[PDB]
């Protein structure tokens, strides 16, 4: 009925950039927390 | 594990043993007939897969042995005949043209009259 490669295209193209953005945000927050001397470094 | 092979083995061995008693019971060998109590019990226990049939066989065997403990040559013969008719017991001898009773050892027909082997 439909094209099979579309499953892979949609799922990979949704999952990869989302994780890239979450990575960027989390590393920013970790750097900010590390800069201020606190209980979590 | 109970299965059809167990019934086949028990039926073979104990039915042959019971059918061997035909000539003995024809005239009367009360001691020799009672000598196969273990065979009768084993056939009743491990060769019939049916509750009602097992109960009937136990009743018939009890009647046979009760007639045995009476010096009763007629009731014993009648009960033996009805047991044979009910349980379908007969002496069986095979040939080689349509044969192959056994192939290897461990079989209950290795050196019996049921055992025929065809070697190419």
């Amino acid at each position: 009925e439909v094209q099979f490669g579309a499953y892979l295209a949609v799922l990979l193209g949704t999952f990869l950039p989302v994780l890239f953005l979450i990575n960027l945000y989390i590393q920013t927050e970790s750097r900010k927390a590390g800069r201020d001397g606190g209980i979590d470094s | 594990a109970k299965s059809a092979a167990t019934q086949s083995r028990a039926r073979g061995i104990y039915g042959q043993r019971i059918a061997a008693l035909e000539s003995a019971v024809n005239a009367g060998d009360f001691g020799a007939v009672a000598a196969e109590k273990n065979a009768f019990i084993l056939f009743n226990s491990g060769a019939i897969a049916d509750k009602s049939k097992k109960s009937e066989a136990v009743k018939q065997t009890n009647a046979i042995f009760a007639a045995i403990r009476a010096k009763d040559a007629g009731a014993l013969k009648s009960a033996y005949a009805t047991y044979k008719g009910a349980n379908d017991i007969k002496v069986i001898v095979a040939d080689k043209e349509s044969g192959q009773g056994y192939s290897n050892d461990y079989d209950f027909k290795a050196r019996t009259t049921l055992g025929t082997i065809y070697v190419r």
Binding site: - | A1, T6, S8, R9, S103, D105, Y106, D107, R120
Partner: protein, 341 residues
Amino acid sequence: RGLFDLVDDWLKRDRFVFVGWSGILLFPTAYLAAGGWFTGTTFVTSWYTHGLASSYLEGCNFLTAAVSTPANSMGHSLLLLWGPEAQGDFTRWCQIGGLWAFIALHGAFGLIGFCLRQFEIARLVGIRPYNAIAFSGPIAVFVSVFLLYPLGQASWFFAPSFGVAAIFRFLLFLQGFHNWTLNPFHMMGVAGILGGALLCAIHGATVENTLFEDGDAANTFRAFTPTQSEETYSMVTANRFWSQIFGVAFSNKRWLHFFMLFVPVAGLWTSSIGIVGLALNLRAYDFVSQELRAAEDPEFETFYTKNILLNEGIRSWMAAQDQPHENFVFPEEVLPRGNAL
């Protein structure tokens, strides 16, 4: 004080061998299991259950004697000496195969007692109980195979027998009927075992070949005080050597030993899962796509199809005598065979 305190003080003294509270479970069960195996491989036969001879009294040697599994007609009976199968009468109990159940049931509690003993001694000397997990590995292997495999099958008859050649029969049987070598869990078990052997050999050699010169004789064994503070060997030289030979090397001394502990236990635990899977006939036997292509194209051939044919041969030529209670009769014209031989 009370009786409990006196018994506790007596059990944890410093005598010939530690007893502890776990000794009550450990000693009788292990002693009985070992004695049962010794008395079964010497006097007891297997004529009435398997149709074999399995004792020194009959003529077997160390490589062929065994304690065989009970008869198939007794499916999963506990086979107690006082049970409804033997009803006392030690001789019938031996003849039907009660010694196998005796040995297995006592040996399981022996293993449990040994693990508890490890816990107790570790607590007494005040150290972490890392030996208990390492032993829990083999406990998993024993439990898994020797108990879970028969319980999912028809009867106890399909369990390994306590003998040298019986284990070989078990190996060949599982290869022939389950294609156990294709399972991705025996693969991880093999990897773990071989990696453990590799680690043992390499650590021994590396430590022995980086010793510091602390003596004057070529016999380097007698240059070690029973215990001192200084390290025996050089870690820097070992790191340099293995990083310039292999490309990567250890640098932390605790990670090395944790890795050594971790590898084989992981291998055993992974293989136990595959055995538990086989217990339910959930095999990894076939590759469906290759079977379909071979069915429709009579020129496709790989090593996988060759192994399949070998398995078929094993089954056909072994089943007749391997399961005597099924009365299998196979005429010569039906047995699969190749050309010539």
